[PDB]
Amino acid sequence: LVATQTTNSQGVATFTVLSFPGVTQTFKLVASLQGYAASTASVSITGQQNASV
Amino acid sequence: SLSVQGTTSESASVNVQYVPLTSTITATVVNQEGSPLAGATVQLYNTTSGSNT
């Protein structure tokens, strides 16, 4: 864990993390929220890319 | 060939051509990781024949 966010009202949960060229930088995004179901998705940025799900 | 046999026996050899008609259908797979899946088998049945040919 390098960054945790409280989700914003602009509907982008943006977090800044180090990156490097030529590596499948996998990231697990867990959403734990009171009022609805907690869910876990995952992505991979390979080099620099916007990973949005 | 136009063998125009008037006064002249005019021998022309006009080539003409025809292209066959083929159809190509494509199918795509994606998920909740937003990454295109490899290895998935997708089967096309021609179901306009009245069975799963």
- Please list the helix, strand and coil fractions of chain B in percent, rounded to the nearest 5, in that order: 0, 15, 85
d(CA A28, CA A44): 9
Question: Is A41 within 8 Å of B32 when comparing Cβ atoms?
Answer: yes
- A44 at interface of B, judged by CB pairs closer than 8 A: yes
Question: Is B34 within 8 Å of A42 when comparing Cβ atoms?
Answer: no
Is the CB of residue B16 less than 8 Å from the CB of residue A26?
A: no
The technique is cryo-EM
- Here the tokens at position B3 are 């063998």
CA distances from B4 to A45, B1, B13, B15 (A): 71, 9, 11, 16
- B31 at interface of A, judged by CB pairs closer than 8 A: no
Tell me, in Å, the resolution of the deposited structure.
11.2
d(CA A26, CA A17): 12
CA distances from A3 to A13, A40, A45, B15 (A): 11, 16, 16, 71
